[PDB]
Amino acid sequence: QCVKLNDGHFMPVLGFGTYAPPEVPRSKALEVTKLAIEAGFRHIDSAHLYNNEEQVGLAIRSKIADGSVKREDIFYTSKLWSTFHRPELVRPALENSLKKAQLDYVDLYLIHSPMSLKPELSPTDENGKVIFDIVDLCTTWEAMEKCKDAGLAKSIGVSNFNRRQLEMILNKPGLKYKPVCNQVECHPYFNRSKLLDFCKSKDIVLVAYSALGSQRDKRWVDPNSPVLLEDPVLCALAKKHKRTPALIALRYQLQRGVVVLAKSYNEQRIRQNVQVFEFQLTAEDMKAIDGLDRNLHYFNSDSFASHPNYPYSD
Ligand SMILES: NC(=O)c1ccc[n+]([C@@H]2O[C@H](COP(=O)([O-])OP(=O)(O)OC[C@H]3O[C@@H](n4cnc5c(N)ncnc54)[C@H](OP(=O)(O)O)[C@@H]3O)[C@@H](O)[C@H]2O)c1
Ligand SMILES: O=[N+]([O-])c1ccc(O)c(CN2CCN(c3cccc(C(F)(F)F)c3)CC2)c1
Numbered sequence: 001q002c003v004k005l006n007d008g009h010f011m012p013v014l015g016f017g018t019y020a021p022p023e024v025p026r027s028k029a030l031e032v033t034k035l036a037i038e039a040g041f042r043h044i045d046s047a048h049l050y051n052n053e054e055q056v057g058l059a060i061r062s063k064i065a066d067g068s069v070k071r072e073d074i075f076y077t078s079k080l081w082s083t084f085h086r087p088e089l090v091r092p093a094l095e096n097s098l099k100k101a102q103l104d105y106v107d108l109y110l111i112h113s114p115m116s117l118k119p120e121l122s123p124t125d126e127n128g129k130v131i132f133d134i135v136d137l138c139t140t141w142e143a144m145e146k147c148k149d150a151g152l153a154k155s156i157g158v159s160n161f162n163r164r165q166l167e168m169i170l171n172k173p174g175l176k177y178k179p180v181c182n183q184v185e186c187h188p189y190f191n192r193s194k195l196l197d198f199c200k201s202k203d204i205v206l207v208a209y210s211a212l213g214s215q216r217d218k219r220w221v222d223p224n225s226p227v228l229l230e231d232p233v234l235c236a237l238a239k240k241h242k243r244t245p246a247l248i249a250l251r252y253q254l255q256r257g258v259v260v261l262a263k264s265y266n267e268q269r270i271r272q273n274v275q276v277f278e279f280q281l282t283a284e285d286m287k288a289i290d291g292l293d294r295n296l297h298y299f300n301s302d303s304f305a306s307h308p309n310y311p312y313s314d
Contacts, residue, residue, distance in 0.1 A: 003259065005180040006203040007148075009107070009155045012075050013254060014276060015043035017209070017263025019050045021217065024265065026055055032265045033059035037069060040274040045183075045209075045261050047079035047112055048097055049121060057101025076103070079112040079159060080144070083119055085135040090143030094152050109153035110183060111140060113160040114309040132307055137165070138172045145176045157181035159207075162311040163198050170202060181259070183207040185214075185299060187228055188252060188292040196258065207259045212246055214298040215263070221298045233288055241279055250276045252289045 002010035016036040018029060029052040033044060037059065046056045060076060063069050078101070084093040094109055117123055118131040125131055144156045157179040158169065169179060182199055186192050186208035199206045213228025214221060228234070234245040241248070246262075250273060253260035262273045281289070297312060304310060 003205065003257075005155055005205065006178045007155050007180050009180070010075075011108070011155075011181070011205060011259055012041075012043035013259050014041065014250070014274070015045050015075075015077070015207070015259065015261040016041040016270075017261045018044060018046045018052055018056055019215070019263060020052070020265055021215070026052060028265060030055035030059050030062075032267075032270065034062060035267050035270050037063045037074075039271045040277075041270075042069070042073060043075040043077070043259075045077045046101075047077075047110075048081045048084075048093060049079065049112060053078065053097055053100040057103050061102060075107040076101075077108040077110065078106050079110040080140075081121060082113050082115055082117040082133075083121065083123065085111070085116045085133065085137065085140045086119055087139045087143035089119065090140060091147055091150075091152070094147050098152065105152055105154060107154045108157060108180070109144065109147060109155075110157050110159045110181075111137070111144070111161075114158075114165050114311065115160070115304055115307045116309065130303055134308060137309075138169065141169055141172065141179075142176075148177060155180045157183065157204075159183035160311055163195055165309070165311065166198070166202070166204070178202070179204060181205040181207050183209055183261075185210050185297050186253070186258060187211045187213060187249060188231070188234065188289050189213075189226070189228060189294050189296040190298075191256075191290065191293045193290075193293070196256065200257070205259050207261060208253050209261050210298055211249055211253055211260050212262060213249075216298070220300060222300055225296060225298060231292060233292055237281070237285060237288070240285075241281075243275065243279065244272065246273065247276055247279075248281070248289070251279065251281055252286070255281060255286060 078097045116133040116135045123131045229245040237248045
């Protein structure tokens with residue numbers, strides 16, 4: 001089922017992850033998203049960065065056209081990339097994203113990250129050092145507010161913000177709309193409980209990404225770090241409930257009132273992940289998973305760690 005946003009709109013509590021790396025043909029994005037919708041998914045998460053909006057838009061419009069689903073049955077998220085943080089660029093980037101997906105509006109538009117870059121998805125100096133930018137994100141937000149006001153996005157939110165960055169938006173002068181959510185890295189090795197409480201107290205949904213340990217992408221993730229789905233507690237619980245570690249991890253998020261994203265480009269696992277609605281972890285199960293937290297984020301950059309808006313300390 002869904003959950004009510006601080007704006008009145010509803011968000012399905014399970015969402016499909018759509019990112020896949022360059023080497024996965026863009027055609028593939030259209031298939032998987034369709035299987036996702038057929039399987040039961042009603043929340044779809046894309047981004048400009050992901051470069052798959054044409055197919056994801058099509059996927060959706062394809063399932064409206066086969067009578068599977070109405071449009072308001074579907075919750076579609078896109079995201080503003082960091083080269084577009086300047087307010088005069090927010091709306092054009094949203095419009096672009098809509099035009100690509102042949103769609104009238106997105107349910108949710110996010111600030112992908114607070115790490116502003118220079119107005120190239122990854123702009124780079126003479127040496128290959130990525131070029132930072134410093135923008136007042138409150139002006140980015142006022143621009144996001146004009147997009148909601150204009151019906152182009154039903155709900156607005158942020159992604160990758162920490163507590164301090166969220167407070168910055170929440171105490172902006174003349175604030176019109178709270179962010180409805182804050183999409184963040186969240187899984188049992190990095191549960192973000194403190195930030196989860198804060199978000200809750202501000203009537204902000206925490207949406208978990210990489211809740212399955214991520215795609216372990218070579219650009220971002222240290223190959224040393226342990227594979228989430230291989231954890232013995234997550235594996236013990238899978239047997240215990242006759243399910244898979246993935247399913248344990250997803251259901252874990254639901255029972256803390258966290259909306260959870262799951263990515264798969266495999267038809268079996270796409271169908272599997274909706275079994276998350278078929279079973280319950282116990283109170284003991286939950287405290288056991290709570291114990292797994294070890295302050296480990298899969299995404300890393302020595303480059304970005306020195307960006308003035310880097311969200312994690314350390
Ligand atoms: N806001 C951001 O900055 C941000 C960052 C990262 C991600 N996201 C969102 O998060 C979404 C997903 O997160 P993620 O892409 O990092 O991946 P993820 O959800 O952690 O999943 C990672 C891997 O788990 C595997 N997997 C999925 N279901 C499984 C199952 N039932 N059993 C076993 N393995 C399974 C998948 O492989 P297969 O594909 O082989 O099934 C996938 O590669 C992304 O699509 C994106 O929408 C947002
Ligand atoms: O699978 N994927 O490769 C993949 C899939 C979906 C995505 O939205 C992205 C893009 N990410 C890049 C990392 N980023 C981030 C956020 C915080 C810290 C750090 C730091 F620790 F690295 F600095 C990085 C969030 C946005 C990559």
